[PDB]
Each structure stands twice: as structure tokens, then as C-alpha cells.
Amino acid sequence: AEAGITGTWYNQLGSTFIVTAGADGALTGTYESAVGNAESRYVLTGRYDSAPATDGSGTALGWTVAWKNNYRNAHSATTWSGQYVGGAEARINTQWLLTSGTTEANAWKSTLVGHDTFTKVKP
Amino acid sequence: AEAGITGTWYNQLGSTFIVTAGADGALTGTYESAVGNAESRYVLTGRYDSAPATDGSGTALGWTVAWKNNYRNAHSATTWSGQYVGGAEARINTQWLLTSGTTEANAWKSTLVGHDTFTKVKP
Amino acid sequence: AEAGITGTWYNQLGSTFIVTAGADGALTGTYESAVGNAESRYVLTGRYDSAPATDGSGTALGWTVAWKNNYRNAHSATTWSGQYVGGAEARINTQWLLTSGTTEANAWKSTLVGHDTFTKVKP
Amino acid sequence: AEAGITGTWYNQLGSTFIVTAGADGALTGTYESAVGNAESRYVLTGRYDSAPATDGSGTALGWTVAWKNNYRNAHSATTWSGQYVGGAEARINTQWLLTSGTTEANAWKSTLVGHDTFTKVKP
Numbered sequence: 001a002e003a004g005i006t007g008t009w010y011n012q013l014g015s016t017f018i019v020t021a022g023a024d025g026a027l028t029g030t031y032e033s034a035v036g037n038a039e040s041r042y043v044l045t046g047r048y049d050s051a052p053a054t055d056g057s058g059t060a061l062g063w064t065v066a067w068k069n070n071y072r073n074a075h076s077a078t079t080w081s082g083q084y085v086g087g088a089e090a091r092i093n094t095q096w097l098l099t100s101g102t103t104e105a106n107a108w109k110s111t112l113v114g115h116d117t118f119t120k121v122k123p
Numbered sequence: 124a125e126a127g128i129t130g131t132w133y134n135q136l137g138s139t140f141i142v143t144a145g146a147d148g149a150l151t152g153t154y155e156s157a158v159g160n161a162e163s164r165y166v167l168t169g170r171y172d173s174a175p176a177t178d179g180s181g182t183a184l185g186w187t188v189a190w191k192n193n194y195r196n197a198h199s200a201t202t203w204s205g206q207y208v209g210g211a212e213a214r215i216n217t218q219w220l221l222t223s224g225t226t227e228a229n230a231w232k233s234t235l236v237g238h239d240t241f242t243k244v245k246p
Numbered sequence: 247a248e249a250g251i252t253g254t255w256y257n258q259l260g261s262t263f264i265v266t267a268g269a270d271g272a273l274t275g276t277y278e279s280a281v282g283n284a285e286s287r288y289v290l291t292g293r294y295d296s297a298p299a300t301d302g303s304g305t306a307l308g309w310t311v312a313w314k315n316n317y318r319n320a321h322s323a324t325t326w327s328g329q330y331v332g333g334a335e336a337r338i339n340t341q342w343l344l345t346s347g348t349t350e351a352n353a354w355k356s357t358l359v360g361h362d363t364f365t366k367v368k369p
Numbered sequence: 370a371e372a373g374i375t376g377t378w379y380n381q382l383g384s385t386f387i388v389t390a391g392a393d394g395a396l397t398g399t400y401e402s403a404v405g406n407a408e409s410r411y412v413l414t415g416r417y418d419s420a421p422a423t424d425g426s427g428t429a430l431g432w433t434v435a436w437k438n439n440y441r442n443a444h445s446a447t448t449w450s451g452q453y454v455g456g457a458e459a460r461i462n463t464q465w466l467l468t469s470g471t472t473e474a475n476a477w478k479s480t481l482v483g484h485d486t487f488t489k490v491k492p
């Protein structure tokens with residue numbers, strides 16, 4: 001976990017995120033998306049539960065990125081929830097929620113759901 | 124947004140979270156759950172997209188909490204994705220993902236999904 | 247369950263669905279939405295798990311509706327997954343997935359997620 | 370679509386489902402899971418939106434399976450929402466919701482979410 005988490009990861013879409021897992025459960029870094037209404041790097045902050053594991057389980061973790069930087073303001077934020085698995089072929093398997101700011105009338109369709117798998121190798 | 128977000132919020136289950144929305148999109152605070160394998164307060168970090176809004180839209184935001192503190196280690200993390208609506212009856216409407224650390228064999232059932240609505244009044 | 251499920255239900259948005267729970271786990275009926283790219287009634291088919299319950303649990307069930315009829319073809323389908331609770335104030339609590347037909351390029355944003363609560367009374 | 374949908378499909382976990390897409394949007398068949406609290410075949414019913422597509426889009430569809438047959442009664446149901454893509458390497462990409470019957474107290478953790486990809490070849 002923690003050490004194993006620190007570094008650069010890439011997913012199936014071609015996004016990249018560089019994160020640092022600090023000693024007490026914090027995750028800090030940047031996310032650069034390949035698709036969407038995103039452009040350049042965005043700031044990401046999150047948490048992981050280590051003290052994870054005498055039965056080779058993954059470490060649970062999650063992070064958030066608001067799609068606003070000095071080039072684009074997409075009026076939305078995405079949160080990724082999943083677990084890290086270390087080893088030869090370490091990966092982070094997640095499911096994500098992307099919510100857009102809407103009017104109360106279209107709030108019912110404000111969130112998209114999907115999944116991403118990240119590897120230390122691209123892809 | 125930001126100012127409107129800062130403060131104490133409560134949801135339908137009885138949880139409470141106190142957050143501070145910093146000038147550049149950061150959310151920091153603590154979460155105390157009423158249900159679950161949680162006990163006391165946990166640290167939460169997240170982000171919001173303001174610069175939100177000439178058509179009364181909500182501000183998109185999200186946060187993460189790892190369920191580990193000095194009393195309990197649940198080996199899991201939850202991320203909430205949603206939007207803030209200010210006004211007389213301001214609220215944050217979210218959908219959440221709770222992932223548990225599992226073995227590769229039970230990873231397919233590692234995540235629960237649900238929804239929570241927070242108000243400045245309880246509830 | 248089954249008997250208790252048969253009838254007309256209404257949700258928070260104002261949609262209505264009339265369903266018949268057949269003896270062996272089948273659900274058949276029509277759905278009329280209030281929001282969306284829907285217009286009139288659409289056909290719905292689904293299943294429930296009864297033989298549900300010596301500890302007052304809800305009955306698990308789910309259904310699907312494709313948003314095509316003789317007035318509109320929205321190129322999408324929604325599935326609702328949840329449980330029925332009977333009693334004075336019986337209700338069906340669900341979470342739903344709405345998927346739209348897209349090109350491989352926008353498949354990552356093809357699904358919206360949300361939740362609906364149905365009562366025998368409107369609302 | 371429809372014709373292309375009819376047949377036997379397999380997913381990443383090793384489950385199999387045989388379905389028949391009828392002329393007017395109905396899907397009928399059986400599902401046999403490889404993981405879970407399932408054993409043998411279960412009945413599945415659902416719908417698809419064809420009249421799908423001058424821009425090579427997928428056809429939206431969804432189905433439900435209640436995990437009860439003459440060998441097991443898991444007190445739960447799963448709904449799959451996604452789209453079919455035909456061609457050399459045709460597939461159905463979905464996201465699913467699995468809800469279990471619980472007491473009102475544990476209803477907040479009654480649903481798991483995940484994703485499955487089905488191919489005509491295993492896997």
C-alpha cells in the first residue's frame with residue numbers, strides 16, 4: 001500500500017494521475033484526463049485505509065478531482081472509489097461518479113457512473 | 124458555494140460532517156457516521172468546482188473518508204459525489220460509493236452504492 | 247410481496263407504473279415517465295425474489311423499460327434494482343441505471359445513475 | 370441489434386446467459402452465474418431499444434434476474450443496464466446493480482454495483 005501507491009498510474013482511456021500516499025492516509029497529486037471537458041492537469045486529494053492484510057486483500061482508497069483549472073471550468077467533479085492491489089502487476093480498480101452542476105429540474109440526470117482500471121504501465 | 128458550504132451538515136442517517144471550503148477548491152474536515160463499522164470522527168478531504176452560475180445551478184463537489192481512526196479500522200473508504208444548492212433550504216445531494224478491501228476473488232462484490240442528502244438542520 | 251406489489255405506484259418525480267406480480271417471480275406492466283425523453287407509456291418486464299422473511303426484510307426485485315413506443319424513440323433503456331417493503335406505508339426503494347446508445351468514443355459517459363422511491367399514494 | 374443479440378454470451382467471471390431478442394423489444398432467456406449465491410440457471414426477462422443508428426452507436430438494453438430457482442433462494446435480484454455493439458467482435462458492455470432483501474436498518478447497504486462485459490466467445 002502507501003509506498004506501492006505513490007507514483008504514476010495510467011488507465012484504459014489514457015488518463016494519467018501522479019499521486020503521493022502520505023504516512024497517515026492522505027493521497028495528494030494531479031490528474032490529467034484524455035477525454036471529457038478537461039484540459040491539462042487538475043488537482044486531486046483523497047484518502048486510503050492502510051493499515052490494510054494477512055490474506056492478500058487490496059487496500060481501499062478514493063479521491064476527488066473538480067474539473068476546473070486555468071484553462072477550463074467544466075462545472076463538474078468526479079470521485080473514484082476502489083482498491084489498490086500490489087505485486088508484479090499492481091493496479092487500482094475503481095468505479096467513479098461524475099456529477100455536473102444543474103438546475104433542480106435536471107438534477108435527476110446530474111450524475112454519470114463508470115469504471116477505470118489503472119496500471120503503472122500504460123496501459 | 125464555498126462560504127455556503129462551510130459549516131456543519133447532517134444527513135438522513137444521522138451522520139455529521141463539518142467542512143471548510145477553502146478559496147481554491149479544497150474541502151477539509153471530519154465525518155462522524157451513525158451507521159456502519161465506524162466509530163468517532165474520521166478525516167475527510169475533497170474538492171468543489173466553483174467557480175460555479177447565472178441559472179441558479181448547484182456547485183459540483185465530492186469528498187473521501189477512509190474508515191480508519193484510533194478506535195476502528197474497517198478496511199474501507201467511501202467517496203461522495205454531488206452538488207451543493209444554497210438558499211433558505213440549502214442542501215448537498217449526493218450518491219456514494221463504499222469500497223472494501225477484498226481478495227481478488229471477492230472484488231466483484233467489493234463496492235456498495237447509495238445516496239445521502241445533507242441539510243444544515245438535522246435533518 | 248407479490249400481491250402487495252401488484253397495483254399502481256408513483257415516485258418523487260411524478261412517474262407512474264402499474265405492475266402485476268405473477269406467482270412465479272415475474273413482473274409485467276407499463277411505465278409512464280414525467281421527466282426525460284419519454285412520452286406516454288412504455289412496456290416494463292422484470293422479476294422479484296419471493297419467496298422472500300421471518301425478520302421483516304424487504305423483497306428484492308428489479309425491472310427494465312426501453313424508452314421506445316409509437317411516439318418516441320429515445321435510444322435508451324433504464325433498469326431499476328431495489329426492494330419492496332409492505333405494511334401501512336409500503337414502498338419500493340430503488341437505485342436505477344439509464345444507459346444511452348453511443349459511439350464507442352462516448353461509451354464512457356453512456357450511463358446515468360439515480361434513485362427513486364415509489365409509494366401507493368402519490369407521492 | 371435483435372438478431373445480433375440472440376444467442377449465447379459469456380462474461381469475464383465465467384457466467385453465461387442465453388437470450389432471445391423478440392421483434393418488439395423483449396429479451397427472454399436464462400442466466401447461469403459462476404460466482405455468488407447462485408446455483409444452476411435462473412430466468413431473465415428484459416427489454417432493448419432498437420429501433421436503434423446511422424452513426425455506428427450501440428443499442429441500449431437491460432435485463433433482470435431474481436436469484437431464486439429450485440436449488441437456491443438467495444433473496445436478491447440483479448439488473449444489468451448497457452448497450453450491445455455488433456460487428457466482428459460484438460459485445461454487450463454493462464454496469465449492474467445487485468440488491469439484497471434487508472431490514473430497514475440495513476437497507477443503506479443493500480445494493481452492490483459492478484460491471485460486466487459479455488462476448489460471444491468465452492471470454
Ligand SMILES: O=C1N[C@H]2NC(=O)N[C@H]2N1
Binds near residue numbers: 013034078
Ligand atoms: O480519466 C477519466 N476517467 C473518466 N471519468 C471522468 O470523470 N472523466 C473521464 N476521464
Ligand SMILES: O=C1N[C@H]2NC(=O)N[C@H]2N1
Binds near residue numbers: 136138156219221
Ligand atoms: O453517513 C453515512 N452514509 C453511508 N455511506 C457510508 O459510507 N457509510 C454510511 N454512513
Ligand SMILES: O=C1N[C@H]2NC(=O)N[C@H]2N1
Binds near residue numbers: 281324
Ligand atoms: O421515472 C423516472 N425516473 C428516472 N429514471 C429514468 O430512467 N428516467 C427518469 N424517470
Ligand SMILES: O=C1N[C@H]2NC(=O)N[C@H]2N1
Binds near residue numbers: 404405446465466485
Ligand atoms: O455474472 C455475474 N455477474 C455478477 N453480478 C451479479 O449479480 N452476480 C455476479 N454474477
